[PDB]
C-alpha cells in the first residue's frame, strides 16, 4: 500500500490532478486550505495520495506530512514562468529534507495544454534537475485539465514503488 | 507567438476584442495607469506588478491571479480567484469557487455586473455557469487580529466609477452596459448583511426557457422589494430531490434528468408568500419548487446547499 505526497506551489494544479486520478469533476475545485486524501488504484497498487495546500503561508505545514512518504509527486505550473524561481527554490529545499531522503520524486510539468507553456526540456535543466543524485527522479509533461500525460507519470510511479 | 500579453505599458488604454484570445492564457505585467479590457474568454490570467490600473477580464476557464498589485479596479469572472502581496484592490467578481487573499490589505469585493452581446457565449466557452457565483465568500490566509484585510464594496457602488466603459475606437465596437438589469451574471448579495431572516427557495428545472424564467422571476422579486441572496446550478439526482423537496419530490422526479437545475435564494419579509403569488401568475404550466412557508424555507435552503456542496466538494 503506497504513500504519495502531492506538493508544489499554490495554483500549480495539485488538486485538479488528484481529482483526475480519481476520475471526478474538476470544475469546482477551490484552493486548498488544509489538505485532501484519496485512494487510487493504478497498475495493481492502492495509492494513498496526500494533496496538500501549497500557498506560501501554509508551506510550513508541509513538514508535518513527510513521514513515511513513499513517493513525492511535485507539480509545477509550466505556464507560469514568473514563478519558476519560487518553485525552483521550494523543490530544492524538499530534496534537502532528511525525512524525504531516498524518496523517488516525479515532477509534473503541468498545464502543457497552454500556450506559454514551457516544455519539460527547459524546466528540467532550468532547475538543473540533472544534478539530483540522491534519488530516482523523472519529469512528465502533462495537463491536469485534459488528463493527458498523467497516466505516463503514474506508470513511472508504479515502476519505482 | 505571445501577442497574448500586456507588458510594461504606461498611461494607455488597450484591450482585446471578441475572438481575439479564444480561450488562450493571457498575461498582464508591469503596467501603470493603464485601462485594460479583455472582451474574450481566457484559459487563465496572471496580473503581475501592476499599479493603478482598470481591468476587465472576460470569462476565465481557470484562475485569475493578482500578485504585487496596487490600486486596481477590476471586473472579472473566473473559476478561481487568488490574491497575494496586493493593496487597495477593488473587484467586481464572478467566481466559481472561494475567493482567496494572502498577504494583502484593503481588498474590496462586489458582484460582477457587466454585459455585452458576445459575453454569454464566452461564459459558455469558459465553462463557467452564471449561477455559480460565490463572490463575497473570501478566505484570508493571513488574517490580522483587530482588523480585516478585506471588505465588501457598498451596494450603491456604480460600476462606471470603478470600471468605466471604453471610449476608444478599437474598444467601443463592443457594446457594453453596466446596468444591473442587463448583467449576464445576476446580481447576488451573497453575504451582505440582511435585515430580514426570511428566505425562499426556488428550483427551476432544465429546459429552453428556464434561464429566461430565472431572470424574469429575479426581476419580479426585486421589483417587489426582495433580494436575491444566491444562485446554484447543479445536477439533482432522485435521492437529492427527496432530501430537499421532501414529500413534494414525486412531482419533480420526471424533470431531473434533462440537465442541471437552477436554484434561487430570495430574502425579505413576505418573500415566500410573494414568491408563491408570482410563480402562480407568471408560470402557469411550468413546474417549479417554491418554499411552502417562512417556517420551512430556511430548512429548504440548507438542504439544497448541503447536497450541492458535496456534489461540488472534494
Ligand atoms: N488550463 C489548465 N488549467 C489547469 C491545469 N491544472 C490546473 N489548472 C487550473 O489551475 C488552477 C489551480 O488548480 P488547483 O488544482 O487548485 O491547484 P492547487 O495546486 O491545488 N492549488 P492549491 O495549492 O492552492 O490548492 C485552477 O484554475 C485549475 O482549474 C491544466 O493542466 N491546464
Ligand atoms: Mg489544492
Amino acid at each position: 500500500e503506497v504513500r504519495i505526497l502531492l506538493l508544489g506551489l499554490d495554483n500549480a494544479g495539485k488538486t485538479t490532478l488528484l481529482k483526475q486520478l480519481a476520475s471526478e469533476d474538476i470544475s469546482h475545485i477551490t484552493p486548498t486550505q488544509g489538505f485532501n486524501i484519496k485512494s487510487v488504484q493504478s497498475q495493481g497498487f492502492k495509492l494513498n495520495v496526500w494533496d496538500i495546500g501549497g500557498l506560501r503561508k501554509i508551506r510550513p505545514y508541509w513538514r508535518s506530512y513527510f513521514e513515511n512518504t513513499d513517493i513525492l509527486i511535485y507539480v509545477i505550473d509550466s505556464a507560469d514562468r514568473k514563478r519558476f524561481e519560487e518553485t525552483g527554490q521550494e523543490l530544492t529545499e524538499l530534496l534537502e529534507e532528511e525525512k524525504l531522503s531516498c524518496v523517488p520524486v516525479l515532477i509534473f510539468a503541468n498545464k502543457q495544454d497552454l500556450l506559454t507553456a514551457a516544455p519539460a526540456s527547459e524546466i528540467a535543466e532550468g532547475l538543473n534537475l540533472h544534478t539530483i543524485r540522491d534519488r530516482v527522479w523523472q519529469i512528465q509533461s502533462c495537463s491536469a485539465l485534459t488528463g493527458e500525460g498523467v497516466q505516463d507519470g503514474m506508470n513511472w510511479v508504479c515502476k519505482n514503488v | 507567438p505571445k501577442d497574448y500579453m500586456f507588458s510594461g505599458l504606461k498611461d494607455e488604454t488597450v484591450g482585446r476584442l471578441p475572438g481575439t484570445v479564444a480561450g488562450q492564457q493571457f498575461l498582464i505585467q508591469d503596467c501603470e495607469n493603464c485601462n485594460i479590457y479583455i472582451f474574450d474568454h481566457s484559459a487563465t490570467v496572471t496580473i503581475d506588478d501592476c499599479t493603478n490600473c482598470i481591468i476587465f477580464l472576460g470569462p476565465v476557464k481557470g484562475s485569475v491571479f493578482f500578485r504585487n498589485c496596487r490600486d486596481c479596479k477590476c471586473t472579472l469572472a473566473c473559476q478561481q480567484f487568488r490574491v497575494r502581496d496586493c493593496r487597495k484592490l477593488e473587484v467586481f467578481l464572478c467566481c466559481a469557487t472561494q475567493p482567496i487573499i494572502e498577504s494583502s490589505s484593503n481588498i474590496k469585493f462586489g458582484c460582477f455586473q457587466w454585459y455585452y452581446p458576445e459575453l454569454a457565449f464566452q461564459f459558455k466557452d469558459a465553462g463557467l455557469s452564471i449561477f455559480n457565483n460565490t463572490w463575497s465568500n473570501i478566505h484570508d490566509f493571513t488574517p490580522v487580529s483587530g482588523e480585516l484585510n478585506w471588505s465588501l464594496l457598498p451596494e450603491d457602488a456604480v460600476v462606471q466609477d470603478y470600471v468605466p466603459i471604453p471610449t476608444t475606437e478599437e474598444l467601443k465596437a463592443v457594446r457594453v452596459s453596466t446596468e444591473a438589469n442587463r448583467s449576464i451574471v445576476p446580481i447576488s448579495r451573497g453575504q451582505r448583511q440582511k435585515s430580514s431572516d426570511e428566505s425562499c427557495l426556488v428550483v427551476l428545472f432544465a429546459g429552453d426557457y428556464t434561464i429566461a424564467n430565472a431572470r424574469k422571476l429575479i426581476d419580479e422579486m426585486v421589483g417587489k422589494g426582495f433580494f436575491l441572496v444566491q444562485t446554484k446550478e447543479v445536477s439533482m439526482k432522485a435521492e437529492d430531490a427527496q432530501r430537499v423537496f421532501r414529500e413534494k419530490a414525486p412531482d419533480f422526479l420526471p424533470l431531473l434528468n434533462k440537465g442541471p437545475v437552477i436554484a434561487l435564494e430570495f430574502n425579505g419579509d413576505g418573500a415566500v408568500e410573494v414568491c408563491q403569488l408570482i410563480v402562480n401568475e407568471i408560470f402557469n404550466g411550468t413546474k417549479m419548487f417554491v418554499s411552502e412557508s417562512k417556517e420551512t424555507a430556511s430548512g429548504d435552503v440548507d438542504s439544497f446547499y448541503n447536497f450541492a456542496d458535496i456534489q461540488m466538494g472534494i
Side-chain angles (χ1 to χ4, degrees):
Chain A
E1 180 145 321
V2 194
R3 220 257 204 188
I4 299 179
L5 201 44
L6 193 48
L7 297 179
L9 302 191
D10 52 316
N11 198 60
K14 299 173 290 306
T15 314
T16 302
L17 213 148
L18 176 78
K19 297 216 91 195
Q20 279 285 183
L21 293 166
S23 249
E24 307 175 2
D25 191 333
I26 63 161
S27 66
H28 298 106
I29 286 163
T30 188
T32 313
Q33 314 163 46
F35 70 107
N36 303 309
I37 61 167
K38 272 186 166 43
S39 309
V40 158
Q41 254 100 12
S42 180
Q43 267 234 240
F45 288 102
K46 48 263 99 49
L47 307 166
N48 309 301
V49 189
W50 299 58
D51 171 35
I52 297 104
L55 65 41
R56 192 177 63 208
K57 167 73 175 169
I58 62 176
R59 319 220 173 115
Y61 281 123
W62 284 13
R63 271 184 142 190
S64 46
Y65 305 98
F66 299 159
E67 204 57 28
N68 255 261
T69 297
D70 296 314
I71 273 82
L72 176 55
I73 293 177
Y74 189 90
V75 189
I76 295 169
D77 190 336
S78 305
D80 196 0
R81 298 161 189 280
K82 208 67 142 294
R83 304 221 289 157
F84 280 176
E85 181 196 305
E86 195 198 324
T87 192
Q89 104 135 314
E90 296 297 339
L91 181 65
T92 329
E93 284 173 20
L94 282 169
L95 305 185
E96 271 156 37
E97 278 290 353
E98 155 211 44
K99 277 160 290 167
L100 291 177
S101 56
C102 284
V103 165
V105 66
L106 168 68
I107 289 101
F108 267 129
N110 187 50
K111 311 191 177 189
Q112 291 269 351
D113 60 85
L114 285 204
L115 89 118
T116 95
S121 295
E122 191 208 286
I123 311 169
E125 59 88 13
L127 313 201
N128 303 280
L129 297 185
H130 314 269
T131 58
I132 300 168
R133 317 276 174 175
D134 197 84
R135 54 154 59 69
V136 174
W137 72 269
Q138 177 70 316
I139 196 163
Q140 232 326 310
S141 295
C142 76
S143 166
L145 206 228
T146 74
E148 188 191 353
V150 172
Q151 197 42 83
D152 286 349
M154 303 302 281
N155 289 350
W156 182 93
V157 160
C158 297
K159 186 184 180 76
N160 300 257
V161 172
Chain B
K2 324 135 287 168
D3 23 293
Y4 293 94
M5 78 197 313
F6 289 136
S7 177
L9 297 186
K10 286 199 200 291
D11 279 8
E12 290 178 55
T13 295
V14 299
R16 288 269 171 280
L17 305 166
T20 215
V21 187
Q24 299 262 71
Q25 160 173 227
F26 207 96
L27 236 54
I28 297 162
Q29 43 161 22
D30 308 290
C31 289
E32 193 183 341
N33 312 293
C34 283
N35 307 142
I36 297 148
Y37 298 88
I38 315 270
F39 299 128
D40 204 11
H41 69 287
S42 295
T44 177
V45 193
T46 54
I47 306 93
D48 285 289
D49 296 290
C50 283
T51 312
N52 220 304
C53 286
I54 279 102
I55 315 180
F56 174 91
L57 309 171
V60 192
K61 175 148 205 200
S63 51
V64 160
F65 209 164
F66 284 86
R67 298 172 313 209
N68 296 302
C69 293
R70 212 218 317 120
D71 287 282
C72 294
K73 329 266 187 161
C74 332
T75 293
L76 71 106
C78 64
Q79 194 265 145
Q80 284 190 356
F81 178 74
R82 305 165 171 271
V83 165
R84 201 173 74 166
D85 304 323
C86 289
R87 255 207 329 301
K88 213 153 222 303
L89 297 199
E90 277 143 312
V91 173
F92 286 90
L93 183 63
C94 185
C95 183
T97 56
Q98 192 168 25
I100 251 70
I101 71 164
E102 185 196 10
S103 307
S104 286
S105 41
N106 255 282
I107 321 292
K108 288 164 168 199
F109 294 86
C111 181
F112 181 108
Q113 200 173 300
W114 203 270
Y115 171 87
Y116 48 96
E118 300 88 325
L119 184 56
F121 287 163
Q122 282 167 18
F123 269 87
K124 190 212 154 74
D125 289 333
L128 298 174
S129 161
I130 68 159
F131 300 102
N132 293 335
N133 177 219
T134 42
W135 66 269
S136 69
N137 189 21
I138 304 351
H139 193 262
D140 187 353
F141 280 85
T142 57
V144 168
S145 191
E147 298 135 286
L148 238 51
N149 294 310
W150 59 278
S151 54
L152 303 170
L153 293 160
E155 277 186 297
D156 68 75
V158 4
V159 184
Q160 272 300 305
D161 295 345
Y162 307 75
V163 189
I165 274 157
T167 60
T168 105
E169 279 192 283
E170 220 200 50
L171 283 176
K172 35 106 146 161
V174 171
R175 287 136 182 279
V176 174
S177 169
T178 65
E179 304 281 4
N181 94 287
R182 282 196 70 114
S183 182
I184 300 296
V185 181
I187 305 305
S188 62
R189 297 180 89 256
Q191 321 245 257
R192 300 194 176 267
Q193 163 137 116
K194 45 249 268 198
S195 21
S196 177
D197 260 17
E198 171 167 9
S199 28
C200 187
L201 178 63
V202 183
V203 184
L204 310 86
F205 306 89
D208 306 316
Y209 4 87
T210 295
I211 294 177
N213 290 330
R215 288 196 198 282
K216 195 160 140 214
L217 184 56
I218 289 163
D219 278 52
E220 293 297 334
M221 291 299 283
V222 173
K224 301 241 177 303
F226 304 96
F227 310 122
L228 172 68
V229 186
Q230 266 249 117
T231 65
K232 230 79 176 156
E233 175 176 6
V234 277
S235 318
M236 258 197 144
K237 265 144 282 162
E239 184 215 342
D240 303 311
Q242 270 137 18
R243 260 217 272 179
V244 191
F245 303 139
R246 282 177 277 132
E247 327 241 49
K248 279 200 192 172
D251 304 28
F252 307 115
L253 274 150
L255 310 163
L256 316 173
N257 225 61
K258 278 95 164 205
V261 308
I262 287 161
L264 318 165
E265 193 191 331
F266 289 109
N267 185 51
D269 291 325
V272 177
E273 188 180 13
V274 170
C275 198
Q276 284 160 340
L277 269 2
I278 296 161
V279 169
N280 180 236
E281 279 157 32
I282 260 135
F283 297 124
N284 270 263
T286 316
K287 41 298 156 293
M288 329 190 325
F289 174 87
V290 187
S291 296
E292 244 165 308
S293 47
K294 160 80 204 255
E295 274 66 56
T296 50
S298 23
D300 294 334
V301 185
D302 259 76
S303 310
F304 196 97
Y305 297 149
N306 257 351
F307 106 76
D309 273 340
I310 282 153
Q311 136 149 355
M312 305 186 333
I314 333 83

PDB file of all heavy atoms in Angstrom, chain B residues 274-299:
ATOM      1  N   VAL B 274     -45.061  36.163  -1.435  1.00  0.00           N
ATOM      2  CA  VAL B 274     -44.944  36.936  -2.672  1.00  0.00           C
ATOM      3  C   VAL B 274     -44.358  36.084  -3.795  1.00  0.00           C
ATOM      4  O   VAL B 274     -44.819  36.141  -4.936  1.00  0.00           O
ATOM      5  CB  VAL B 274     -44.135  38.232  -2.463  1.00  0.00           C
ATOM      6  CG1 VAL B 274     -43.808  38.886  -3.786  1.00  0.00           C
ATOM      7  CG2 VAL B 274     -44.913  39.201  -1.596  1.00  0.00           C
ATOM      8  N   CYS B 275     -43.358  35.273  -3.470  1.00  0.00           N
ATOM      9  CA  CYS B 275     -42.812  34.356  -4.468  1.00  0.00           C
ATOM     10  C   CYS B 275     -43.876  33.381  -5.003  1.00  0.00           C
ATOM     11  O   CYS B 275     -43.973  33.169  -6.203  1.00  0.00           O
ATOM     12  CB  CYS B 275     -41.605  33.605  -3.930  1.00  0.00           C
ATOM     13  SG  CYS B 275     -40.666  32.904  -5.266  1.00  0.00           S
ATOM     14  N   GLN B 276     -44.674  32.817  -4.103  1.00  0.00           N
ATOM     15  CA  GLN B 276     -45.776  31.934  -4.472  1.00  0.00           C
ATOM     16  C   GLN B 276     -46.740  32.627  -5.410  1.00  0.00           C
ATOM     17  O   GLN B 276     -47.096  32.081  -6.446  1.00  0.00           O
ATOM     18  CB  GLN B 276     -46.512  31.431  -3.227  1.00  0.00           C
ATOM     19  CG  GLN B 276     -45.753  30.326  -2.455  1.00  0.00           C
ATOM     20  CD  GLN B 276     -46.212  30.158  -0.989  1.00  0.00           C
ATOM     21  OE1 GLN B 276     -46.826  31.058  -0.397  1.00  0.00           O
ATOM     22  NE2 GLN B 276     -45.887  29.008  -0.402  1.00  0.00           N
ATOM     23  N   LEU B 277     -47.143  33.845  -5.059  1.00  0.00           N
ATOM     24  CA  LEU B 277     -48.088  34.604  -5.880  1.00  0.00           C
ATOM     25  C   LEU B 277     -47.599  34.817  -7.316  1.00  0.00           C
ATOM     26  O   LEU B 277     -48.368  34.653  -8.263  1.00  0.00           O
ATOM     27  CB  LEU B 277     -48.392  35.935  -5.219  1.00  0.00           C
ATOM     28  CG  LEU B 277     -49.573  36.065  -4.248  1.00  0.00           C
ATOM     29  CD1 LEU B 277     -50.346  34.763  -3.974  1.00  0.00           C
ATOM     30  CD2 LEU B 277     -49.137  36.766  -2.955  1.00  0.00           C
ATOM     31  N   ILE B 278     -46.320  35.170  -7.463  1.00  0.00           N
ATOM     32  CA  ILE B 278     -45.706  35.450  -8.770  1.00  0.00           C
ATOM     33  C   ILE B 278     -45.633  34.178  -9.623  1.00  0.00           C
ATOM     34  O   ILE B 278     -46.086  34.153 -10.770  1.00  0.00           O
ATOM     35  CB  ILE B 278     -44.311  36.081  -8.604  1.00  0.00           C
ATOM     36  CG1 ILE B 278     -44.429  37.442  -7.927  1.00  0.00           C
ATOM     37  CG2 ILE B 278     -43.636  36.281  -9.931  1.00  0.00           C
ATOM     38  CD1 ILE B 278     -43.130  37.935  -7.299  1.00  0.00           C
ATOM     39  N   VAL B 279     -45.083  33.120  -9.043  1.00  0.00           N
ATOM     40  CA  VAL B 279     -44.987  31.843  -9.724  1.00  0.00           C
ATOM     41  C   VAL B 279     -46.360  31.400 -10.217  1.00  0.00           C
ATOM     42  O   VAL B 279     -46.503  30.947 -11.359  1.00  0.00           O
ATOM     43  CB  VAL B 279     -44.297  30.781  -8.831  1.00  0.00           C
ATOM     44  CG1 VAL B 279     -44.429  29.380  -9.424  1.00  0.00           C
ATOM     45  CG2 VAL B 279     -42.841  31.151  -8.656  1.00  0.00           C
ATOM     46  N   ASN B 280     -47.362  31.568  -9.361  1.00  0.00           N
ATOM     47  CA  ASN B 280     -48.730  31.181  -9.665  1.00  0.00           C
ATOM     48  C   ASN B 280     -49.326  31.962 -10.837  1.00  0.00           C
ATOM     49  O   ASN B 280     -50.094  31.407 -11.619  1.00  0.00           O
ATOM     50  CB  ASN B 280     -49.598  31.336  -8.412  1.00  0.00           C
ATOM     51  CG  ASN B 280     -51.046  30.950  -8.644  1.00  0.00           C
ATOM     52  OD1 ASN B 280     -51.951  31.740  -8.400  1.00  0.00           O
ATOM     53  ND2 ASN B 280     -51.271  29.734  -9.111  1.00  0.00           N
ATOM     54  N   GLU B 281     -48.965  33.237 -10.959  1.00  0.00           N
ATOM     55  CA  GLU B 281     -49.494  34.111 -12.011  1.00  0.00           C
ATOM     56  C   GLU B 281     -48.707  34.010 -13.318  1.00  0.00           C
ATOM     57  O   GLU B 281     -49.278  34.039 -14.409  1.00  0.00           O
ATOM     58  CB  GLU B 281     -49.534  35.573 -11.527  1.00  0.00           C
ATOM     59  CG  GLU B 281     -50.762  35.906 -10.647  1.00  0.00           C
ATOM     60  CD  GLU B 281     -50.587  37.111  -9.703  1.00  0.00           C
ATOM     61  OE1 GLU B 281     -49.850  38.074 -10.049  1.00  0.00           O
ATOM     62  OE2 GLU B 281     -51.222  37.092  -8.616  1.00  0.00           O
ATOM     63  N   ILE B 282     -47.396  33.861 -13.198  1.00  0.00           N
ATOM     64  CA  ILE B 282     -46.480  34.117 -14.298  1.00  0.00           C
ATOM     65  C   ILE B 282     -45.840  32.842 -14.858  1.00  0.00           C
ATOM     66  O   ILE B 282     -45.203  32.878 -15.912  1.00  0.00           O
ATOM     67  CB  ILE B 282     -45.478  35.238 -13.863  1.00  0.00           C
ATOM     68  CG1 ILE B 282     -45.922  36.579 -14.451  1.00  0.00           C
ATOM     69  CG2 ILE B 282     -44.018  34.920 -14.179  1.00  0.00           C
ATOM     70  CD1 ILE B 282     -45.877  37.739 -13.462  1.00  0.00           C
ATOM     71  N   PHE B 283     -46.052  31.707 -14.193  1.00  0.00           N
ATOM     72  CA  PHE B 283     -45.507  30.443 -14.683  1.00  0.00           C
ATOM     73  C   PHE B 283     -46.484  29.275 -14.683  1.00  0.00           C
ATOM     74  O   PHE B 283     -46.073  28.116 -14.499  1.00  0.00           O
ATOM     75  CB  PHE B 283     -44.243  30.047 -13.910  1.00  0.00           C
ATOM     76  CG  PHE B 283     -43.107  31.013 -14.063  1.00  0.00           C
ATOM     77  CD1 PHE B 283     -42.525  31.590 -12.946  1.00  0.00           C
ATOM     78  CD2 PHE B 283     -42.619  31.340 -15.317  1.00  0.00           C
ATOM     79  CE1 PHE B 283     -41.476  32.480 -13.079  1.00  0.00           C
ATOM     80  CE2 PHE B 283     -41.578  32.229 -15.456  1.00  0.00           C
ATOM     81  CZ  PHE B 283     -41.000  32.803 -14.335  1.00  0.00           C
ATOM     82  N   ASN B 284     -47.768  29.564 -14.909  1.00  0.00           N
ATOM     83  CA  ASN B 284     -48.755  28.508 -15.083  1.00  0.00           C
ATOM     84  C   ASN B 284     -48.226  27.516 -16.084  1.00  0.00           C
ATOM     85  O   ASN B 284     -47.707  27.902 -17.127  1.00  0.00           O
ATOM     86  CB  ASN B 284     -50.088  29.072 -15.563  1.00  0.00           C
ATOM     87  CG  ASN B 284     -51.006  29.454 -14.408  1.00  0.00           C
ATOM     88  OD1 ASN B 284     -51.889  28.675 -14.016  1.00  0.00           O
ATOM     89  ND2 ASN B 284     -50.792  30.647 -13.841  1.00  0.00           N
ATOM     90  N   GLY B 285     -48.307  26.238 -15.743  1.00  0.00           N
ATOM     91  CA  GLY B 285     -47.909  25.186 -16.661  1.00  0.00           C
ATOM     92  C   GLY B 285     -46.433  24.878 -16.592  1.00  0.00           C
ATOM     93  O   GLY B 285     -45.970  23.913 -17.199  1.00  0.00           O
ATOM     94  N   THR B 286     -45.695  25.700 -15.848  1.00  0.00           N
ATOM     95  CA  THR B 286     -44.286  25.439 -15.583  1.00  0.00           C
ATOM     96  C   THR B 286     -44.087  25.042 -14.124  1.00  0.00           C
ATOM     97  O   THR B 286     -44.399  25.796 -13.199  1.00  0.00           O
ATOM     98  CB  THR B 286     -43.389  26.628 -15.969  1.00  0.00           C
ATOM     99  OG1 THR B 286     -43.804  27.135 -17.242  1.00  0.00           O
ATOM    100  CG2 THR B 286     -41.921  26.193 -16.056  1.00  0.00           C
ATOM    101  N   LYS B 287     -43.573  23.836 -13.946  1.00  0.00           N
ATOM    102  CA  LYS B 287     -43.343  23.237 -12.641  1.00  0.00           C
ATOM    103  C   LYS B 287     -42.036  23.764 -12.033  1.00  0.00           C
ATOM    104  O   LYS B 287     -40.968  23.682 -12.642  1.00  0.00           O
ATOM    105  CB  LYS B 287     -43.355  21.698 -12.761  1.00  0.00           C
ATOM    106  CG  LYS B 287     -42.623  21.143 -14.024  1.00  0.00           C
ATOM    107  CD  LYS B 287     -43.258  21.601 -15.379  1.00  0.00           C
ATOM    108  CE  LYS B 287     -42.277  21.579 -16.583  1.00  0.00           C
ATOM    109  NZ  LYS B 287     -41.152  22.585 -16.533  1.00  0.00           N
ATOM    110  N   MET B 288     -42.155  24.359 -10.851  1.00  0.00           N
ATOM    111  CA  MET B 288     -41.011  24.807 -10.078  1.00  0.00           C
ATOM    112  C   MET B 288     -41.248  24.457  -8.614  1.00  0.00           C
ATOM    113  O   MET B 288     -42.390  24.351  -8.162  1.00  0.00           O
ATOM    114  CB  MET B 288     -40.818  26.326 -10.171  1.00  0.00           C
ATOM    115  CG  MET B 288     -41.238  27.005 -11.466  1.00  0.00           C
ATOM    116  SD  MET B 288     -40.728  28.748 -11.612  1.00  0.00           S
ATOM    117  CE  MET B 288     -40.875  29.276  -9.926  1.00  0.00           C
ATOM    118  N   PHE B 289     -40.169  24.304  -7.860  1.00  0.00           N
ATOM    119  CA  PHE B 289     -40.318  24.216  -6.431  1.00  0.00           C
ATOM    120  C   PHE B 289     -40.219  25.597  -5.787  1.00  0.00           C
ATOM    121  O   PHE B 289     -39.252  26.315  -6.003  1.00  0.00           O
ATOM    122  CB  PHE B 289     -39.293  23.258  -5.823  1.00  0.00           C
ATOM    123  CG  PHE B 289     -39.315  23.248  -4.333  1.00  0.00           C
ATOM    124  CD1 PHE B 289     -40.180  22.396  -3.644  1.00  0.00           C
ATOM    125  CD2 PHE B 289     -38.503  24.112  -3.608  1.00  0.00           C
ATOM    126  CE1 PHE B 289     -40.224  22.383  -2.262  1.00  0.00           C
ATOM    127  CE2 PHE B 289     -38.545  24.106  -2.223  1.00  0.00           C
ATOM    128  CZ  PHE B 289     -39.415  23.236  -1.549  1.00  0.00           C
ATOM    129  N   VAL B 290     -41.223  25.951  -4.992  1.00  0.00           N
ATOM    130  CA  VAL B 290     -41.196  27.161  -4.177  1.00  0.00           C
ATOM    131  C   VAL B 290     -41.443  26.742  -2.747  1.00  0.00           C
ATOM    132  O   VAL B 290     -42.330  25.935  -2.484  1.00  0.00           O
ATOM    133  CB  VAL B 290     -42.311  28.140  -4.551  1.00  0.00           C
ATOM    134  CG1 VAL B 290     -42.149  29.444  -3.795  1.00  0.00           C
ATOM    135  CG2 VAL B 290     -42.332  28.387  -6.041  1.00  0.00           C
ATOM    136  N   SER B 291     -40.677  27.293  -1.820  1.00  0.00           N
ATOM    137  CA  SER B 291     -40.907  27.023  -0.406  1.00  0.00           C
ATOM    138  C   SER B 291     -42.370  27.258   0.001  1.00  0.00           C
ATOM    139  O   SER B 291     -42.994  28.220  -0.453  1.00  0.00           O
ATOM    140  CB  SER B 291     -39.963  27.868   0.444  1.00  0.00           C
ATOM    141  OG  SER B 291     -38.616  27.496   0.194  1.00  0.00           O
ATOM    142  N   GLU B 292     -42.908  26.363   0.836  1.00  0.00           N
ATOM    143  CA  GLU B 292     -44.296  26.445   1.318  1.00  0.00           C
ATOM    144  C   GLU B 292     -44.533  27.604   2.272  1.00  0.00           C
ATOM    145  O   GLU B 292     -45.581  28.247   2.214  1.00  0.00           O
ATOM    146  CB  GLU B 292     -44.719  25.142   2.002  1.00  0.00           C
ATOM    147  CG  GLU B 292     -45.843  24.393   1.311  1.00  0.00           C
ATOM    148  CD  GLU B 292     -45.972  22.943   1.817  1.00  0.00           C
ATOM    149  OE1 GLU B 292     -44.935  22.226   1.825  1.00  0.00           O
ATOM    150  OE2 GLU B 292     -47.101  22.511   2.202  1.00  0.00           O
ATOM    151  N   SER B 293     -43.568  27.863   3.158  1.00  0.00           N
ATOM    152  CA  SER B 293     -43.698  28.949   4.143  1.00  0.00           C
ATOM    153  C   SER B 293     -42.362  29.510   4.618  1.00  0.00           C
ATOM    154  O   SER B 293     -41.302  28.979   4.302  1.00  0.00           O
ATOM    155  CB  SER B 293     -44.528  28.495   5.352  1.00  0.00           C
ATOM    156  OG  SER B 293     -44.092  27.231   5.804  1.00  0.00           O
ATOM    157  N   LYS B 294     -42.445  30.605   5.371  1.00  0.00           N
ATOM    158  CA  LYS B 294     -41.338  31.166   6.146  1.00  0.00           C
ATOM    159  C   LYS B 294     -40.726  30.073   7.063  1.00  0.00           C
ATOM    160  O   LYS B 294     -39.502  29.973   7.222  1.00  0.00           O
ATOM    161  CB  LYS B 294     -41.870  32.379   6.952  1.00  0.00           C
ATOM    162  CG  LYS B 294     -41.041  32.843   8.177  1.00  0.00           C
ATOM    163  CD  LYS B 294     -39.841  33.711   7.776  1.00  0.00           C
ATOM    164  CE  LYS B 294     -38.692  33.721   8.822  1.00  0.00           C
ATOM    165  NZ  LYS B 294     -38.590  34.994   9.646  1.00  0.00           N
ATOM    166  N   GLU B 295     -41.600  29.242   7.619  1.00  0.00           N
ATOM    167  CA  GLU B 295     -41.243  28.224   8.590  1.00  0.00           C
ATOM    168  C   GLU B 295     -40.393  27.084   8.033  1.00  0.00           C
ATOM    169  O   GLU B 295     -39.678  26.436   8.773  1.00  0.00           O
ATOM    170  CB  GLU B 295     -42.524  27.644   9.192  1.00  0.00           C
ATOM    171  CG  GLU B 295     -43.089  28.421  10.375  1.00  0.00           C
ATOM    172  CD  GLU B 295     -43.598  29.809  10.020  1.00  0.00           C
ATOM    173  OE1 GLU B 295     -44.475  29.929   9.115  1.00  0.00           O
ATOM    174  OE2 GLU B 295     -43.113  30.775  10.669  1.00  0.00           O
ATOM    175  N   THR B 296     -40.473  26.840   6.732  1.00  0.00           N
ATOM    176  CA  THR B 296     -39.770  25.701   6.138  1.00  0.00           C
ATOM    177  C   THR B 296     -38.657  26.111   5.175  1.00  0.00           C
ATOM    178  O   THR B 296     -37.767  25.318   4.873  1.00  0.00           O
ATOM    179  CB  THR B 296     -40.760  24.752   5.431  1.00  0.00           C
ATOM    180  OG1 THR B 296     -41.614  25.511   4.559  1.00  0.00           O
ATOM    181  CG2 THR B 296     -41.615  24.013   6.457  1.00  0.00           C
ATOM    182  N   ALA B 297     -38.718  27.361   4.722  1.00  0.00           N
ATOM    183  CA  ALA B 297     -37.793  27.928   3.728  1.00  0.00           C
ATOM    184  C   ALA B 297     -36.332  27.802   4.121  1.00  0.00           C
ATOM    185  O   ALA B 297     -35.512  27.346   3.336  1.00  0.00           O
ATOM    186  CB  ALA B 297     -38.126  29.367   3.489  1.00  0.00           C
ATOM    187  N   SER B 298     -36.017  28.224   5.338  1.00  0.00           N
ATOM    188  CA  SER B 298     -34.679  28.086   5.880  1.00  0.00           C
ATOM    189  C   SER B 298     -34.237  26.630   5.742  1.00  0.00           C
ATOM    190  O   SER B 298     -33.201  26.356   5.126  1.00  0.00           O
ATOM    191  CB  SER B 298     -34.614  28.604   7.328  1.00  0.00           C
ATOM    192  OG  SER B 298     -35.907  28.604   7.966  1.00  0.00           O
ATOM    193  N   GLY B 299     -35.039  25.692   6.248  1.00  0.00           N
ATOM    194  CA  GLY B 299     -34.761  24.268   6.059  1.00  0.00           C
ATOM    195  C   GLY B 299     -34.456  23.950   4.604  1.00  0.00           C
ATOM    196  O   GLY B 299     -33.449  23.302   4.288  1.00  0.00           O
TER     197      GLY B 299
END
